[PDB]
Design a protein around this ligand. Structure first.
Ligand SMILES: *[C@@H]1O[C@H](CO)[C@@H](O[C@@H]2O[C@H](CO)[C@@H](O[C@@H]3O[C@H](CO[C@H]4O[C@H](CO)[C@@H](O)[C@H](O)[C@@H]4O)[C@@H](O)[C@H](O[C@H]4O[C@H](CO)[C@@H](O)[C@H](O)[C@@H]4O[C@H]4O[C@H](CO)[C@@H](O)[C@H](O)[C@@H]4O)[C@@H]3O)[C@H](O)[C@H]2NC(C)=O)[C@H](O)[C@H]1NC(C)=O
Ligand SMILES: *[C@@H]1O[C@H](CO)[C@@H](O[C@@H]2O[C@H](CO)[C@@H](O[C@@H]3O[C@H](CO[C@H]4O[C@H](CO)[C@@H](O)[C@H](O)[C@@H]4O)[C@@H](O)[C@H](O[C@H]4O[C@H](CO)[C@@H](O)[C@H](O)[C@@H]4O[C@H]4O[C@H](CO)[C@@H](O)[C@H](O)[C@@H]4O)[C@@H]3O)[C@H](O)[C@H]2NC(C)=O)[C@H](O)[C@H]1NC(C)=O
Ligand SMILES: *[C@@H]1O[C@H](CO)[C@@H](O[C@@H]2O[C@H](CO)[C@@H](O[C@@H]3O[C@H](CO[C@H]4O[C@H](CO)[C@@H](O)[C@H](O)[C@@H]4O)[C@@H](O)[C@H](O[C@H]4O[C@H](CO)[C@@H](O)[C@H](O)[C@@H]4O[C@H]4O[C@H](CO)[C@@H](O)[C@H](O)[C@@H]4O)[C@@H]3O)[C@H](O)[C@H]2NC(C)=O)[C@H](O)[C@H]1NC(C)=O
Ligand SMILES: *[C@H]1O[C@H](CO)[C@@H](O)[C@H](O)[C@H]1O
Ligand SMILES: *[C@H]1O[C@H](CO)[C@@H](O)[C@H](O)[C@H]1O
Ligand SMILES: *[C@H]1O[C@H](CO)[C@@H](O)[C@H](O)[C@H]1O
Lengths: 368, 368, 368
């Protein structure tokens, strides 16, 4: 018969899912940024530019004011409209003569004799064009479009575990187990060798696997515990849908107190553990201790949940069981993000190198 | 006694191997290629070259025909033979005057006054030499030699699971369990506390762990199932070698319906799960439920497979159990491949940057 | 009742820790080095320098001797003191006229007419300044400070498993189980539903989970074995602290014969397996088969270890259980190291590219 501790294996596998919910899934390697370094290179270039170039960014009546493009439209014989926003952003702090003179001294361009200034200008313009071409690589905007946020991932994990965007509180306010469709008895709710369960998410599957009820508390209801049964008082023959207090006494078997540094491999290993504990029969696959007939919670039957989507002839969990598919989506999005962070590293490092060379007065003369 | 579900843990571990066979192990991150970008840079260089350089690649009697090196041997006072193949490939489409004039307009070299053309040529020749030096890095050809194919990996996994290069079909045509050496009784086939098994691969180990036979179907033969025993009809005291129908009723407990994105970590975790379920005794290590004496399939004995290669005094599975060693080889080859893909990324990104600069007419003047 | 094989799951999880101890945790991807390539670039630069520059590194009375900076202090009107150590290291082999003439021929600078030499010098000086700026990136010294050693990691793993810096030998010389605090009886030592254990490390936890004693050898003492019980003879009601022979008969259930290529993911999966097998009760969490009351080793009680640090209301193992926290530290240090190796790759590849260009006589003329 099924007794104390018999479902420890399944509980561990399901809790490895549950623990990733709430706001515990953390995205560490995050937005690798190079825009400040690029902006610094662009502003160095504008500072080094001839004063008649900076003058194009000034209002005709007030030298300290940025040019208005209705007041002074850009010349049509130029590609200036294609670059004006970035140029004007570089020029704005420089419209102040005190800020500009400071930047010239800071970048070591002050006092440079004309020929030496020309050669410094040439190297800076070359390095700036190189910085733009590295920062504007297509696999940069692509990589950028592949990055997600801790937020988006957290919401999708909560969907697979709770069919909700946020984890329900300790009383499970707003939550209704089994999507409101629980009826009749435990085996109708949790499934059998011939019928699928009503559990569409990870939390309700854990409830089928681990909840005691009013008849098994002294026996099979201890499958996931050691000392005492969860004590739900679940009476599915009278009130099929369990209460939030009932659900929380099962959730507290899992670690909802820590955090997990998300990783596609972490998600994979957890999904694989659940998926391969599925016992494939002719009509259903069963997760949990199972002796005979159905997942009624009786010590002679089963403490388990059943799925019709995978069998000994068809189905793969991360594609055909909806809640495991949704969690596989998080792994997929984590992989893309992880590769992007790696790809966005090269421009970042190269732009730092360029900014260092642009501030080396000796190099500016050599590379000219 | 051993009964329904007692081997779910071991089945899950073994099926995590079996599911990687057939053509389900997929290599995602594949050949990172930069040869098209390099070829484009080389053809840009040839187009920009002086017309008397392109003329060296033409037949003396037909300007549209490539030079024949028997008809017109290359000068010995040059390193031209060391570069001719790549140069001739760049020059071939350019031998057509219409294609060449188009490429000149496309690369924005047409109409350039002589001094501006010379400076553009200088920058392109410099960028092309840089592209070659990046593309010809030694850790590029090395990385290239470390890359494998989904095919080679799939064949080695099928060797560890089936001792064959392809997964046997549903009737196991062409396959003979236990390499034709099964004899006497189940315990002679599957091993004991004193003797090793006849199972040399993963599939036959799963058979020892999970097959019912004609005597245990109502008891220990349900160790890996829920509702019904596999129903092999295996009668090893009369016909020791099971049939293909018998083997398939056990294989269908595993997920042969999906695919796995291969990963050294995936392989590691799966090998580690199997290896540490091995129960180390003085003379053998046992995988599977074991109560007494041997792996006979009796409810009082064992549903298991034994190996003499590892014990409580010696042996490590991924080195001393042949089938686990072969699968560790796939992990090793996956690691090399994964690092190579990463190393081949840098040349790829740099060549894209160079091609962008070479097509920027403003940069070609600045960098000269 | 608890019997043969009932703790195989827990043993596998704990042995996955134990196997990482001793000197079996191997750091593969190790120090990515670029200093030899940098030193080669710096020495190429010094060789190409004007002879009057090399002369600054010579003693005034002996041209073959390095300048002494007390004898001939460096000029104050220069930044020479900021670069002298690296310059002098590049110059030292060149003070020998035969070595210098050889290096000039080797780098193909001999016989170069003056204008061609000047242009070669210009390109080499530019490439050398670029090499320095890449090699001196801040995320290089940072990455360098993040790298650890197989040694440091091995010592911290041995702390989590043994509370010692090295793994005890087969007789456990120098080791005292349970930090010398074992007393009274098995349940006082290994814990209960109300009390924590005396086991502060991984080895002593495995002892609580898997050791037989003088009363359970024929029953619960076989929870982690197949054929024969470990045979400790442990008699905690008389001599609470087990002997080294006793401890070794339990350790030999784990694989101490191989090696593991360390990986944060490897550590994570192993920590997660242990952490989620912890059965959370109101006052303790229990690892191991548990039927009633305590971890006394009786077949009706438990073969297990208990922790008060995590419960069904608080605690996360990798932060609140000291030995699991220490092992999580190894994972954290492995992640930093793995990212560093990746970041230190870019300078390495770029310096190889520069050294190749500096040795290409054709490029030295083009890039001038
Ligand atoms: C770092 O800082 C530097 C400055 O130090 C900055 O350089 C500036 O770059 C921009 C963009 O590359 C340059 O913009 C060019 O400006 C010229 C000059 O236009 C003025 O002068 C002419 C008289 O010669 C007037 O007619 C005109 O009204 C302006 O007052 C333009 O002629 C250029 O436009 C032509 O070329 C473009 C291609 O580059 C075409 O897209 C465009 O349609 C124009 O084509 C015309 O001329 C072509 C000549 O080849 C011809 O083929 C076409 O048929 C057509 O007739 C261009 O807009 C600007 O001058 C630079 N400033 C200085 C002081 O050098 C860098 O941009 C900055 N780096 C970064 C990355 O921010
Ligand atoms: C991008 O596109 C450019 C063109 O825009 C292309 O440039 C070509 O590069 C190749 C390889 O670098 C150059 O090949 C050289 O050609 C000269 C010229 O040979 C002709 O003219 C001489 C008369 O001066 C005739 O005697 C001869 O028969 C040819 O008609 C050769 O002299 C060069 O060979 C010498 O130097 C090599 C080292 O670079 C040696 O390996 C070789 O043995 C030769 O050594 C001889 O001269 C040495 C002088 O230093 C001397 O030391 C030796 O003792 C010996 O006497 C070389 O083959 C070619 O000219 C370039 N073309 C143009 C138009 O510039 C790039 O290759 C292309 N980029 C890429 C990456 O594809
Ligand atoms: C690769 O190999 C090359 C050689 O091929 C090597 O180049 C050497 O680089 C160093 C460092 O960049 C150069 O050092 C400079 O040396 C000059 C010359 O000093 C001598 O001559 C003057 C007379 O002109 C004497 O007065 C003096 O006593 C020496 O005999 C120095 O003048 C330079 O110092 C000034 O500039 C530095 C900034 O770069 C300041 O930090 C320093 O305080 C000095 O400032 C003074 O002059 C400034 C002028 O702008 C002025 O603004 C200040 O107020 C102040 O008055 C500097 O030390 C050396 O000359 C190069 N050698 C050659 C032959 O070219 C590369 O270093 C090497 N690459 C690598 C990476 O190893
Ligand atoms: C589960 O199976 C037991 C044993 O046959 C039976 O008593 C229950 O009614 C059933 O749900
Ligand atoms: C396995 O062990 C059982 C129980 O002792 C015995 O009956 C079988 O004959 C043996 O193979
Ligand atoms: C463990 O529990 C058993 C069964 O109740 C009891 O006999 C032992 O004394 C206790 O330690």
């Amino acid at each position: 018969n099924i007794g104390t501790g018999d479902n420890v294996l399944h509980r561990a596998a399901l809790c490895g899912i549950i623990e990733l919910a709430g706001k515990r899934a953390k995205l560490e390697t995050a937005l690798p940024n190079f825009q400040n370094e690029l902006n610094s290179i662009l502003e160095l270039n504008m500072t080094a530019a001839e004063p008649t170039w900076l003058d194009q960014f000034r209002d005709k009546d007030d030298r300290s004011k940025p040019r208005d493009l209705t007041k002074q439209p850009l010349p049509k014989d130029t590609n200036w409209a294609d670059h004006w926003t970035a140029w004007a952003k570089a020029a704005l702090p420089l419209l102040n003569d005190e800020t500009h003179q400071a930047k010239l001294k800071e970048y070591k361009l002050a006092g440079l004799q004309p020929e030496k200034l020309e050669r410094a200008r040439n190297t800076i313009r070359r390095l700036t064009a190189e910085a733009v071409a590295k920062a504007q690589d297509p696999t940069v905007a692509e990589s950028t479009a592949d990055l997600t946020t801790e937020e988006d991932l957290q919401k999708q994990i909560n969907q697979a575990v709770y069919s909700k965007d946020t984890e329900p509180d300790d009383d499970f306010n707003g939550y209704t187990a089994f999507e409101g469709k629980a009826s009749t008895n435990r085996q109708t709710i949790c499934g059998s060798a011939v019928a699928g369960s009503k559990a569409t998410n990870a939390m309700d599957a854990l409830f089928c696997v681990c909840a005691d009820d009013r008849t098994n508390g002294a026996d099979a209801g201890k499958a996931c515990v050691a000392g005492t049964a969860p004590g739900t008082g679940w009476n599915p023959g009278v009130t099929a849908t369990p209460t939030g207090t009932m659900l929380q006494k099962v959730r507290k078997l899992c670690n909802t107190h820590g955090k997990t540094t998300l990783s596609a491999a972490a998600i994979e290993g957890r999904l694989t553990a659940v998926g391969n504990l599925l016992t494939r029969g002719s009509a259903t696959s069963i997760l949990g201790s199972f002796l005979a007939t159905d997942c009624s919670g009786d010590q002679g039957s089963g403490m388990c949940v059943a799925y019709t989507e995978v069998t000994d002839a068809k189905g793969t969990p991360t594609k055909d069981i909806p809640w495991m598919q949704k969690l596989d989506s998080v792994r997929i999005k984590l992989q893309k993000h992880e590769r992007a962070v790696e790809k966005l590293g090269k421009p970042q490092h190269d732009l730092k190198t360029i900014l260092t060379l642009a501030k080396d007065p000796a190099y500016l003369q050599l590379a000219s």
